[PDB]
Design a protein around this ligand. Structure first.
Ligand code: ED4
Ligand code: FPP
Ligand code: ZN
Lengths: 407, 323
């Protein structure tokens, strides 16, 4: 109909989704109200300017931003001097989602740089000559797999890598992030991710790990950093994704988990919050929403017959609307929320989340939903590794050619 | 000695007492990627850090240098590791180092490395006497800081300091009853002291929750806590619950109260209740109201619940295909 608004966030009913603070004010409600007011202006701007809305993903602007960053960054990034493989990964994955090919001389230069980051005793560090650490180790491996050449694959020293993993393993099932460092759920995921991709998983590498992760699920349904802690989108993604890799999803109560994540989508904003009663943030478009494809695959393997055959169990339309209208910087790059500044982390994860929301798939069934102009459509991403599904398949196959170190 | 922001600060390459050391430039290769254009101050500090690291120089002067390297980038875990080597190897006073870390955390409280350093210090000294008060100060500026609550849980557990925490939780729930971190600490304390099997305790906890829900019907934390503490034994095990919630429909309704109703019916149909069918249709109705009207953001979820309940609790669900 002509009177019908095709954008979900702009419909007049939508106004009913504003915060009800019951006339009791606290720090939590004051802060939530500020964001909602700021988002309402973004939604209303078309009406006040008397223009018809058009949701366009600014491919060109984002490409320039990335293409440059991949080579050189301003001193604003001094606080990331110990996280450079992360920058390689964030940027290469963004380009991959945007379907921008990687000049082969770039590929070679990335390989060589990551070699300098690799420790003599296994794993990668945050930069040349820095000690190894599981987080940059996870990023390094992912970046080389995105590149996906023989050169890239050959960078990784598999014997050492497994030695490294063993030196971090704890008797209770957990891993340290690094020697003399902290334990939390992220480290199990990092370890399971690089070990499965490179085919180095021994019979006892992950003894007790699934059980330790399961102890992190709490009374809320979600997963915390360590046993006892508040449930959070980042740790929950890591916990479930690690279990999927190990084939132990069933150790969790999948039902209370599913109820928890779906509650993390904000009724007004359309995006996701990281934990109950906090603020929406573009990066959770991946950590939170990325859980629904994982749950879908898990419940389906248990024979669940009630599952949809065309949609994930979250509002795909509304998430796309939040990202496209509120999370893009005009000059290129993406962001946390309006009023915040752009950066490569949010560029990576906002786009990753957009892809999730555009692409549904369950074996044989396949269904897309692309809001705004059709050129918005992105390349799809693997929900466990957050690299291209093809790049995953290509890598696993290649490393299955080698024997697990120690035979 | 010479603070990194002092107006009279001087680069290391211009300091006499460092004249013997050759700085060591970063090795980024012949054609760099993600190369950062460091400022002068930064590149100068790190060129000298690489020199002392490389030579494993364990001196007073290297110790002071790590302070500047950390302040330029507190996320540099390699520098933190070297600093801990020098603490032990030079035999540095660890209370003085606690004074140091408490200041760094005050200014950069959302960094992983600074909290881990504090923990190691407490471990070394075996002294938790400053901790609860320090953490309370941080929480007084951001009552939801994840690292802060984690450190608080670790301290209490390792040193068994349980006796005043519930009182602290009650204080923060007063300030902001919407604070999910605090509801989590509440469950953490009770779980590890009395437990929730004590009928008197569970009773107390539910009255209090229902009381807070009445004061602030749309606060989701309270709703999640009530569900959390009843769902393990099973919602249908508590038959007065249902009627008491319906009695809030009139003047205390929300999509949260509706959703809970669905959860109660769901459990009832699993523990084989009376009026099997009357209960089912009540639930399918609510699932529909939520998907179409009261909570449409979750339409895909509520339609899934509706299908699930039908798939396994309808009168035809056990009836063979031939009938
Ligand atoms: C709200 N939030 C979401 N993720 C995190 S995080 O996990 O704490 N950290 C992101 C820190 N974070 C802040 C942030 C992100 N969204 C909102 N905020 C305020 C970042 C991180 C990187 C950039 C960039 N570019 C921009 C912001 C991601 C990194 C930080 C540390 N890290 C890491 O490997 O670095 C070290 C090993 C050096 C610690 C891996 C995970 C916080
Ligand atoms: C593999 C890997 C390294 C994954 C990253 C996992 C991840 C995103 C963890 C989040 C950790 C954290 C302290 C969040 C809270 O920050 P905040 O309080 O500033 O954010 P919030 O208010 O949205 O909770
Ligand atoms: Zn974010």
């Amino acid at each position: 109909p002509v009177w019908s608004e095709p954008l979900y966030s702009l419909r007049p009913e939508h106004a009913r989704e504003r915060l009800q603070d019951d006339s009791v004010e606290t720090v939590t409600s004051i802060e939530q109200a500020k964001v909602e007011e700021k988002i309402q202006e973004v939604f209303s701007s078309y009406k006040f300017n008397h223009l018809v809305p058009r949701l366009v993903l600014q491919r060109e602007k984002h490409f320039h931003y990335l293409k440059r960053g991949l080579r050189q960054l301003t001193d604003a990034y001094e606080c990331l001097d110990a996280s450079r493989p992360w920058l390689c990964y964030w940027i290469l994955h963004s380009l991959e989602l945007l379907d921008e090919p990687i000049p082969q001389i770039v590929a070679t230069d990335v390989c060589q740089f990551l070699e300098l980051c690799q420790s003599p005793d296994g794993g990668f560090g945050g930069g040349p000559g820095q000690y190894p650490h599981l987080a940059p180790t996870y990023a390094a491996v992912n970046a080389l797999c995105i590149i996906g050449t023989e050169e890239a694959y050959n960078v990784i020293n598999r014997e050492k890598l497994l030695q490294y993993l063993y030196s971090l393993k704890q008797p209770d099932g957990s891993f340290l992030m690094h020697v003399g460092g902290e334990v939390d759920v992220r480290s199990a995921y990092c370890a399971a991710s690089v070990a499965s991709l490179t085919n180095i998983i021994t019979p006892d590498l992950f003894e007790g790990t699934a059980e330790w992760i399961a102890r992190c699920q709490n009374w809320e349904g979600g997963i915390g950093g360590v046993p006892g802690m508040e449930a959070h989108g980042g740790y929950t993604f890591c916990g479930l994704a690690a279990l999927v890799i190990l084939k132990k999803e069933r150790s969790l109560n999948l039902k209370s988990l599913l109820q928890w994540v779906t509650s993390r989508q904000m009724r007004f904003e359309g995006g996701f919050q990281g934990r109950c009663n906090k603020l929406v943030d573009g990066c959770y478009s991946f950590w939170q929403a990325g859980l629904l494809p994982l749950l879908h695959r898990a419940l389906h393997a248990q024979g669940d017959p009630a599952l949809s055959m065309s949609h994930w169990m979250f509002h795909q339309q509304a998430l796309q609307e939040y990202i496209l209208m509120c999370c893009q910087c005009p000059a290129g790059g993406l962001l946390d929320k309006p009023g915040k500044s752009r950066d490569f982390y949010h560029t990576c994860y906002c786009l990753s989340g957009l892809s999730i929301a555009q692409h549904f798939g369950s074996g044989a069934m396949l269904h897309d939903v692309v809001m705004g102009v059709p050129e918005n459509v992105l390349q799809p991403t693997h929900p466990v590794y957050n690299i291209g599904p093809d790049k995953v398949i290509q890598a696993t196959t290649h490393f299955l050619q080698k024997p697990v170190p120690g035979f | 000695f010479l603070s990194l922001d002092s107006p009279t600060y001087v680069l290391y390459r211009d300091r006499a007492e460092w004249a013997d050391i050759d700085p060591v430039p970063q090795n980024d290769g012949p054609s760099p990627v993600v190369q950062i254009i460091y400022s002068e101050k930064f590149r100068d500090v790190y060129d000298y850090f690489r020199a002392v690291l490389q030579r494993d120089e364990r001196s007073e002067r290297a110790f002071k240098l790590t302070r500047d390297a950390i302040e330029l980038n507190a996320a540099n875990y390699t520098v933190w590791h070297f600093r801990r080597v020098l603490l032990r190897s030079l035999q540095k006073d660890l209370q003085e180092e606690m004074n140091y870390i408490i200041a760094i955390i005050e200014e950069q409280p959302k960094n992983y490395q600074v909290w881990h350093h504090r923990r190691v210090l407490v471990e070394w000294l075996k002294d938790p006497s400053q901790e609860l008060e320090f953490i309370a100060d941080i929480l007084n500026q951001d009552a939801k800081n994840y690292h802060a609550w984690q450190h608080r849980q670790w301290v209490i557990q390792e040193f068994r300091l349980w006796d005043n925490e519930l009182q602290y939780v009650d204080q923060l729930l007063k300030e902001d009853v919407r604070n999910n971190s605090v509801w989590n600490q509440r469950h953490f304390v009770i779980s590890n002291t009395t437990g929730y099997s004590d009928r008197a305790v569970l009773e107390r906890e539910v009255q209090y929750t229902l009381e807070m829900i009445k004061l602030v019907p749309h606060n989701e934390s309270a709703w999640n806590y009530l569900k959390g503490i009843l769902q393990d034994r099973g919602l249908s095990r508590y038959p007065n619950l249902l009627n008491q919630l319906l009695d809030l429909q009139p003047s205390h309704s929300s999509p949260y109260l509706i959703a809970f109703l669905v959860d109660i019916y769901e459990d009832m149909l699993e523990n084989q209740c009376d009026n099997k069918e009357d209960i089912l249709n009540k639930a399918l109705e609510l699932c529909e109201i939520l998907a179409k009207e009261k909570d449409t953001i979750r339409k895909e979820y509520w339609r899934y619940i509706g299908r699930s309940l039908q798939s396994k609790h309808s009168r035809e669900s056990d009836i063979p295909a031939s009938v």
